[PDB]
Amino acid sequence: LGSMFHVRYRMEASCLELALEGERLCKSGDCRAGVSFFEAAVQVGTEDLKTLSAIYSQLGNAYFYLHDYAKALEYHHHDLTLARTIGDQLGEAKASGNLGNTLKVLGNFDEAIVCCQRHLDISRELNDKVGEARALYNLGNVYHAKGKSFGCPGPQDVGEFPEEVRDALQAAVDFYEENLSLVTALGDRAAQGRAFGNLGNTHYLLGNFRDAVIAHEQRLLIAKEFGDKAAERRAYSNLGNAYIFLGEFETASEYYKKTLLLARQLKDRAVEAQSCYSLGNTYTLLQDYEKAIDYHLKHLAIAQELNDRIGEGRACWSLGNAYTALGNHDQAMHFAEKHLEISREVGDKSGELTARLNLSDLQMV
Amino acid sequence: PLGSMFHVRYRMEASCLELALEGERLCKSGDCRAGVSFFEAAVQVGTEDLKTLSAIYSQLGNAYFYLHDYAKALEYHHHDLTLARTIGDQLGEAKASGNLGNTLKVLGNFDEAIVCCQRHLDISRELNDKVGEARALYNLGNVYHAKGKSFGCPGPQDVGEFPEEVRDALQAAVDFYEENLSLVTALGDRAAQGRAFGNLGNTHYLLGNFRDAVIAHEQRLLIAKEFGDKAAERRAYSNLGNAYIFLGEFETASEYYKKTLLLARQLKDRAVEAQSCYSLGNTYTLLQDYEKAIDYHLKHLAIAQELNDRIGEGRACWSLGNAYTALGNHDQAMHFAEKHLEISREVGDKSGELTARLNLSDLQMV
Amino acid sequence: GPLGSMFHVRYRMEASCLELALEGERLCKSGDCRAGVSFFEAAVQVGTEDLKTLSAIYSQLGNAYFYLHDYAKALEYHHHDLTLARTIGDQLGEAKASGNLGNTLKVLGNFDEAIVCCQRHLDISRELNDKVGEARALYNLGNVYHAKGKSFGCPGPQDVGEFPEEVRDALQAAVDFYEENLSLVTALGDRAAQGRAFGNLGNTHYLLGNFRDAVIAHEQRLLIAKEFGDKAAERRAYSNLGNAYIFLGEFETASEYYKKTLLLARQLKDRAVEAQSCYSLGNTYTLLQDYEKAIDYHLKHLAIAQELNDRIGEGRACWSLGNAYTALGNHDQAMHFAEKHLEISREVGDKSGELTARLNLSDLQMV
Amino acid sequence: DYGNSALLSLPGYRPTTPGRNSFYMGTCQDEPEQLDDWNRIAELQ
Amino acid sequence: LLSLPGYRPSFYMGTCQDEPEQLDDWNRIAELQQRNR
Amino acid sequence: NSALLSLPGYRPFYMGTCQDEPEQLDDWNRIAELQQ
């Protein structure tokens, strides 16, 4: 009892108070305002190096989420520098990991490898098994991204890819499987799911489609266990993709159908449209062009709804070729015009030249 | 009329001296933005006369300096120095070094600024030019004063841990100002004595030598009265009030801030008038006479709203909130705390916004 | 039945690198290089196996960016073309890429490296005994030194010497290269290249102060322009000839060459060249002290300037008219254009003109 | 310089000489960037 | 550790109020124009 | 002396330019002839 002293509360704004406000704003999802309050706490400064380390790291993570990777690099670099000088090698490893992921997005893979390697080595030295696993997952992600950054991906007919890409993807497989081994031993079902998903997509890019199916089937089972409908839908989509490349189009259609089922229940119009587009291409492979037109039209309508102009042109080109395979030359000419119009409007120089070469031929019959 | 074979020579359109003279007249009138264009035009034409060229460079540097384009001020003062050195004009070399030093001083390149102003001093002593020697001493004092001032605003009221780097720089400024004062008093230049006393007083003020600061500013005040310079008189009154605050004699400080307000109202300077009211508000807060503190903080608020000074409006709102809280007016305190929150959001004062929230939470409970 | 109802499905594919490249080239042929660039860079994204094709894409992208005044990307793609030609040891391609890289560097003011690249073009051409390439490299080197000499002192004291020695040396080097080009081009019987050489040789002599040699070279340019029926080149020759005769002091001859520029300008309906011709005629008759004719042509220039909204040229006419009227004695008409000169000089930032218009009105008011 | 393949710094090139050959497919969508970190600061001594 | 931003293990006044920087030079060129005329 | 004339302005009608010859880019048809 004695609350007639509050002119002393009127001065303030403590290093800690600004920081806590920044964190609450990021918790609510407004990281743009959170950054201002974090940098304000930086201006005030503090004596407590443990607090300062936390501020730098959450500023890096906040800038990372706001796609300002340059300043994300700045503050994670400061966190690493601070952790190194006072010897919190526990802090050093975690900062190296965040610095690595930042470098991974910027495309500086060579330094990204080193930083996450530093995270792995320190975790193994301290016998930090959860940190070791997270390092393995990070390394897998970096090599997965490195392999993907060269890809105009070609398993086409019988295709070859550069040795650099195969080596990077195989390295990702090794890291993911090492992560999986340690995560299964720790009994972390969530991390097991994430590992199976990325392992499956890496095999998918490599051309190891049977192994991809197996991994995504495990992702599906874990997604059901957690009731994560979003993850369930991703597994269904990846499974459909893999069965396409195996040549079993009937099986693929039923997996894409299950993606559509969950998309309609989540009322996700964007995923619903992508599902219809995949179904349209599946029935094109099955040469049932009537069903292909049905799904490509459903995709077109959702695209026009969401004003997705890019996807509109994709539907027009597909519809043109579906109608051409049936013989409707008047309906084909209609969508080929719409393909030319959209391709001009969005700057698709490739599409514009194709739509011209399509109308020239179509006009003659 | 008796000479109409005139206007083929003034018609031609050209000369360097004519462009230069136009630039100088524009700077005399205070429009240095237009003067710069005419000076750089004379530069494009060029001249044979190196003494004229030296004058052009120097006045371009001084013009750019006044327009806060310190990068080009450095360019032309550097050219003036280069020219003075090649032709061996040592008096011109010293003056150019001084101007280059002051430019570097604003740019925060203190180490090179010391070198240039030291060069000005050395050449002045070598030529036995006492007025140039004095000006160089004053410049060196100013540079060290600025160097000491540049180590962190987070030393408010009233620090305590002064780093030795700062103390050494401020003490060097004191030495130079006193050397300037000695030479200026011997030359009988009362104006320069006033300027020295002012800067000496403010240096002692930053050092924490408040009694010496009072003494120096009292001398500045006497010289300001001698010259009838009301502006300088008001500056002396303001510095004196500041110093008496740190001595702990708040009653004396209030009467000096009152005299600043008197001269501010007679000069019709609304901005200085508002700063004076704000200082008076804080003085009576230290005297715990919160009724008088509210009176002056309100007068400051009204002038702030007049001048649309949004920053100063928030400062008044926060002060009024805590003055009313010290009296017990919970409703009036909540009003200004809300206005403090609003302004703090509008101006991006993240610190102020969080405080206004922590203030309203507590105030609401009565 | 069609001949291709399922070979229509073969074009429903997507677009090949060659197809995108050919579209880019057709757009540049039509003169819309802004759209051509997009299709070229699209072909770059697709990529190709054929290094000969890739070399052509880089070079035509550099030339396209050059025309669009985006010299930074012109440097990029010509540098890639040079790099590719060097790795595959295509020495003919290496020389051509060096020449284009040199001309790009010439525009962006880096003459020292531009010399190196064009010298490389010359050396490889001589090594392969490629006489047409040797000639083009000589012409390029002449152009670079011509531009180097022209950079600085533009504007800047130029009558009877003496300048910097650096400028005279660069212009003399241009003369040497142009004459070497001329010798090789005359031996190859390339009349078009002979014309281009004579023009640039004449303008180099003109800057050097060798006005008699400039006249001779431009007279040859004029004869070749007539041979090809190139009215544009014919008009350029007439203009250069007038300029040279002014500096020789033969103003009557100069007026008749400027008159012939005006004739061709009126027939091509080129208002801008037509105005420049009237302005030159106005100054010529001022030198001949026939101020009535000078006012006539300076007025014709003023009207076209106001039409084209050329505010700069409007002030130039006002200043000339003021002094032409002053030489006649029309003090009221002179004061009118001197005021207009002051107004324009303020509006366009001509600080020199503004001070002179003031010094003009002061004097005019008193008589 | 010796380098038959080191010139690959030049934009896109290089030649080398049940079931589904050719015709188009789509993309694949990976796993979530997992940010659990919005409560590292809030625990303090 | 010694260079990392903001660390080491106010109330409003309006402090200082310095003395004004002196410029008067707008005379030297016209002054030279009676030194040769 | 070499440092002396490094500064702008030194040392003891209207015209119209020399109007040079236009930059030669007669090239637009390499790629169509490369269709071999």
Author numbering:
A (entry chain A): 3 to 367
B (entry chain E): 2 to 367
C (entry chain C): 1 to 367
D (entry chain B): 1864 to 1880, 1897 to 1924
E (entry chain F): 1870 to 1878, 1901 to 1928
F (entry chain D): 1867 to 1878, 1902 to 1925
Article sentences:
NuMA is the dynein/dynactin adaptor that in mitosis assists spindle assembly and orientation processes. In metaphase, when spindle positioning takes place, NuMA accumulates at the cortex by association with LGN. The TPR domain of LGN interacting with NuMA comprises 8 tetratricopeptide repeats (TPRs), each consisting of a couple of antiparallel helices organized in a concave super-helical array, in such a way that the first helix-A of each TPR faces the inner side of the super-helix, while the second helix-B is positioned outside. Here, we show that the dynein adaptor NuMA and membrane-localized LGN assemble in oligomers that can form multivalent interactions key to sustain effective pulling on astral MTs.
To gain insights into the topology of the NuMALGNBD:LGNTPR hetero-hexamers, we determined their crystallographic structure at 4.3 Å resolution. Overall, the hetero-hexamers arrange in a donut-shaped architecture, with the backbone of the donut formed by the three LGNTPR protomers concatenated in a head-to-tail fashion, and a central triangular cavity reflecting the threefold symmetry of the assembly. In such an arrangement, the flexible NuMA chains thread in-between two adjacent LGN subunits, and then line in the internal groove of the TPR domain. The donut assembly is promoted primarily by the formation of a four-helix bundle containing the TPR8 and the capping helix of one LGNTPR protomer (named here LGN-1 for clarity), and the N-terminal helix preceding the TPR1 of the neighboring LGNTPR molecule (LGN-2), in a sort of molecular grip. This topology explains why deletion of residues 7–13 or 350–367 of LGNTPR impairs hexamer formation. More specifically, residues 1864–1880 of NuMA-1 start with two helical turns interrupted at Pro1874, where the chain bends in an elongated polypeptide, and packs against helices-A/B of the second TPR motif of the LGN-2 subunit, facing Leu54LGN-2 and Tyr58LGN-2. Analytical SEC experiments revealed that disrupting the NuMA1861–1880:LGNTPR interface prevents hexamer formation, confirming that hooking of NuMA1861–1880 on LGNTPR is essential for oligomerization. We conclude that NuMA has a bipartite LGN-binding domain consisting of a nanomolar affinity peptide spanning residues 1900–1928 and a disjunct upstream oligomerizing motif encompassing aa 1861–1880, which is essential for hetero-hexamer formation. The toroidal architecture of the hexamers is allowed by the characteristic TPR array of LGN featuring a long TPR4 that confers a pronounced curvature to the scaffold.
